[PDB]
Ligand binder design. Structure first.
Ligand SMILES: NC(=O)c1ccc[n+]([C@@H]2O[C@H](COP(=O)([O-])OP(=O)(O)OC[C@H]3O[C@@H](n4cnc5c(N)ncnc54)[C@H](O)[C@@H]3O)[C@@H](O)[C@H]2O)c1
Ligand SMILES: NC(=O)c1ccc[n+]([C@@H]2O[C@H](COP(=O)([O-])OP(=O)(O)OC[C@H]3O[C@@H](n4cnc5c(N)ncnc54)[C@H](O)[C@@H]3O)[C@@H](O)[C@H]2O)c1
Lengths: 319, 319
């Protein structure tokens, strides 16, 4: 019932996944296990989330019960910023493999086109914004392509099935495609009605790159983190346009928000934090949005970005 | 006196220049010569403008009369898109050198982070959007850094004094700063009240990269091209905000648009097509805009871009 998308790498990827950001370490295992019982097979993780051991526990618990086999589970992870230097990429990936308790990860993405100064895993892990010098941000001169080549070698070694990037603007993706031997199979970016970036989506899809949307519910995820920008933003759940469309099809605003992406070939990985939401978030492909629906939703676009490195240390990624 | 900006390269660059885009071949020489008589020293040229031979004629004449020494003239040229492949870089720069009739150019910029398929100079020059296959666009897999390294060698070889980029968004500029040995001394971008990109400007200036603005008069130069977007755009010259400020100081709207950039450390290169414009376009630094003036002009920013490769062939540079 959950459609798969064939990636450029030849591997299938579930179009609907389970987000693991802000998934508390204490109950992450149980929640992953429950998600698997509810039918989820793709888990979107990241070294930065610091809960890869638990995610690992959940998957293993499901495997040991005979519910699923490793091959039916799609595990996504992401190379954090301090590990872009080629000599540290495998180190970081091994940490991920060890925590997840697997021989390979299905998708490994460059979390951000940002290279923080390397911080040994034994000193702090996950490092987050720590760059080895108090509260100061420190960067290292590592071109993206260098990192990508290190990733390509790890695909050859069998440690990763497919590789991709996250938070890459068009200019940067274009350039990477110029020096890439294995084409980035996935582009994962913030995508919701307030930040539609239709041209980036079009370019990427036409390039054979698969889009995975994050923060499909817009400001919600950031409101939970008390971010001022998200708090000041009218929610998509209560937006007149989203509610009217939801009423038109007798669906929920959340379902419309996920379908809006799904119907255009974009993969989603909503964060489900309630049993009810677990079900709702994988049962929205029960209707089709019309051309007029898309045009109405299109008006919501205002280039409002919630996940922006500009906010951390004026990193010009999206300027 | 036209103030100078010290580039990161150590060389001085006039803060006010003479644009050479659309400068007619038949009169380009005389026009540059007159500009030199009027005091201009920097000339913003480009292989794509198809008039470097004539721009050179103009400079040579000024020198042959003892008006100025090569030492005093600042020549900027740009590497066109068909010449990114490293093996074609020096040949393109040579063609530029011969045309301008000089041993070196003061500034050589990668015109666009776009790499068209090579087209021999003898087959067509300038090639423009021609890629060797009728009206089709054909690209080469040459990462920016490969092109940049070629440029660096040419600096070592004494054929270029300073190198830089043009039409580079922040993420791409950042990645390049990670691979460059010689840092980009200049970032030349479309810049006017409808496309202010304040964060990009901020980022670049803090990195020591000098900003050179083009199309300081907004839709104006593109209207001269019968461009739809520019034709449907209220002119900056008749905009209430600009009109009001100009009146307040008894200045023309054009002087306010030029000072708006200058006061912020941004170099300008207006296209002067009339003797009086020629003089005025280099004499506007006689007043300062106030904090409020800047605040009023800031409200004009709508990220409206007139020079976008997305229009050529949906090239994702600015998405
Ligand atoms: N690569 C990146 O930079 C990046 C950044 C952010 C998130 N991600 C990934 O993508 C996922 C995106 O999720 P997100 O955390 O941004 O948030 P969403 O997935 O934006 O969900 C945000 C919040 O809305 C609520 N919600 C979820 N389903 C709902 C429903 N059916 N009805 C009402 N409310 C509902 C929950 O409270 C949840 O915390 C993450 O978990 C993570 O795996 C990646
Ligand atoms: N790197 C790039 O991509 C790029 C792109 C466009 C232009 N440029 C450069 O920057 C220069 C300026 O751009 P435009 O885009 O040519 O220039 P503007 O500086 O956009 O000038 C456009 C027009 O305004 C008019 N004008 C000039 N001075 C005036 C005045 N005082 N009062 C009223 N009208 C006036 C003229 O008709 C002129 O053609 C170019 O000549 C070129 O060298 C670079």
């Amino acid at each position: 019932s959950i459609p798969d998308i064939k990636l450029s790498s030849g591997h299938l990827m579930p179009s609907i996944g389970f987000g693991c950001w802000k998934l508390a370490n204490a109950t992450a295992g149980e929640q992953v296990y429950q998600a698997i019982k509810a039918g989820y097979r793709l888990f979107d993780g990241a070294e930065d989330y610091g809960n890869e051991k638990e995610v690992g526990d959940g998957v293993k618990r499901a495997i040991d019960e005979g519910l699923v086999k490793r091959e039916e589970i799609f595990l996504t992870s992401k190379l954090w910023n301090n590990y872009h230097d080629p000599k540290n990429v495998e180190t970081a990936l091994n940490k991920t493999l060890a925590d997840l308790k697997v021989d390979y990860v299905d998708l490994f993405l460059i979390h951000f086109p940002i290279a923080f100064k390397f911080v040994p895993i034994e000193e702090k892990y996950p490092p987050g914004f720590y760059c080895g010098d108090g509260n100061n941000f420190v960067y290292e001169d590592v071109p993206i392509l260098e990192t990508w080549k290190a990733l390509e070698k790890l695909v050859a070694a069998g440690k990763i099935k497919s590789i991709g990037v996250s938070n890459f603007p068009g200019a940067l993706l274009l350039d990477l495609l110029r020096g890439a031997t294995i084409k980035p199979a996935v582009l994962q970016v913030e995508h919701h009605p307030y930040l539609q970036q239709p041209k980036l989506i079009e370019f990427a899809q036409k390039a054979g790159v698969t889009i995975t949307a994050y923060s499909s519910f817009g400001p919600q995820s950031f409101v939970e983190m008390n971010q001022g920008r998200a708090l000041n933003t009218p929610t998509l759940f209560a937006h007149d346009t989203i509610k009217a469309i939801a009423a038109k099809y007798n669906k929920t605003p959340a379902e419309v928000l996920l379908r809006w992406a799904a119907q255009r070939g974009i993969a989603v990985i909503p964060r489900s934090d309630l049993p009810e939401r677990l079900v709702q978030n994988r049962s929205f492909n029960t209707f089709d949005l019309t051309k007029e629906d898309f045009e109405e939703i299109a008006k919501l676009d205002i280039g409002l970005r919630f996940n922006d490195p500009w906010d951390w240390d004026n990193i010009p990624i999206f300027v």
